[PDB]
């Protein structure tokens, strides 16, 4: 049987799928994530602040 990928298939997004939230997913915290500090963030935290010292 043809072992190759099949061109001639619908390349468009499919507007026929459950559009609702899926209540069947692991609801628990995920113990498989980088636990380190992540050195990839803006070190200049100054574009947005409350001009009033108090809120």
């Amino acid at each position: 049987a043809n072992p190759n990928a099949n061109p001639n298939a619908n390349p468009n997004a499919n507007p026929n799928a459950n559009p609702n939230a899926n209540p069947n997913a692991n609801p628990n915290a995920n113990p498989n994530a980088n636990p380190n500090a992540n050195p990839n963030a803006n070190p200049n935290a100054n574009p947005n602040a409350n001009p009033n010292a108090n809120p």
Partner: antibody
Amino acid sequence: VQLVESGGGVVPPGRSLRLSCATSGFTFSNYGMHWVRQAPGKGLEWVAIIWYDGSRNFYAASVEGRFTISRDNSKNTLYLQMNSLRVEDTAVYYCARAAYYDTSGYGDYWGQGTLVTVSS
Amino acid sequence: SVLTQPPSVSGAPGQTVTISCTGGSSNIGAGYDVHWYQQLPGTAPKLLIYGNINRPSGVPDRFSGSKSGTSASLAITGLQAEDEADYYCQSYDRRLSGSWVFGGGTKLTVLG
């Protein structure tokens, strides 16, 4: 914006050297800083970053634990204290002003650097 | 060397030359923005390109950038004698502890 560097020179291996990047033309206290280095004849290597308020610091793996980065915001000055210098640390060190775009950061102004030589 | 750059590029003044930089799924194809710096023989690198395509107002409109998958790019049109320089790419490698990673640089020689 202007960054000025001083502190290079020849130091016997094992000894320390301090670099100092004097700055002006911007509010030093509102920006983080970087150091990079370039050994003669080599390309660029990132060395360290310090957050605008000193709340977070990161080091290249090859220098972590030997180098200390700090800021004296009141003097508009960035420092790099290198202890236990090795011959392999010979390089022009440069300071740069941290900048950030979207998914990654960058430098948007560079100092001129100074040459640190470690030699017997 | 984290990002891969060819060691050399050249052409005559008036010609178009390009400088490439290829990464992997951890640094360029990873969605991290690629930046470019130009270093002249007696000084520090200068920001040439940022955000893959943009550039400082201090850069002549002779330079521009791009990106496709893991391949980043710098194009120089209207090559001048004054473009002799070391061109470096920069990105962020999610597998490493450093804020910035660099390629080894490409040496541009203008055949003047």
